[PDB]
Amino acid sequence: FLRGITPLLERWLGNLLSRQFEGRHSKGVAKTVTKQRVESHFDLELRAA
């Protein structure tokens, strides 16, 4: 178990630490389109076209 959880927590605790020290840069990351958000996204791209 620990063999495989070691790199997973190394990444996760890295991400935890990095936003704890660097702050969270994530403003303007591309939000993806998902179940509820499809129908509003169709209306965006329709009205834009």
The footprint of RNA (CB under 7 A) covers: 1-8, 35-36
- Report residue 46 as tokens: 């329709």
Rounded to whole angstroms, the Cα distance separating 8 from 11 reads 5
Q: Minimum distance between the CB of residue 3 and RNA, rounded to whole angstroms?
A: 4
Dihedral over alpha carbons 24, 25, 27, 31 (to 10 degrees): -90
Q: Tell me whether residue 30 or residue 46 sits nearer to RNA (CB atom).
A: 30
Q: Tell me whether residue 34 or residue 47 sits nearer to RNA (CB atom).
A: 34
Q: Minimum distance between the CB of residue 8 and RNA, rounded to whole angstroms?
A: 4
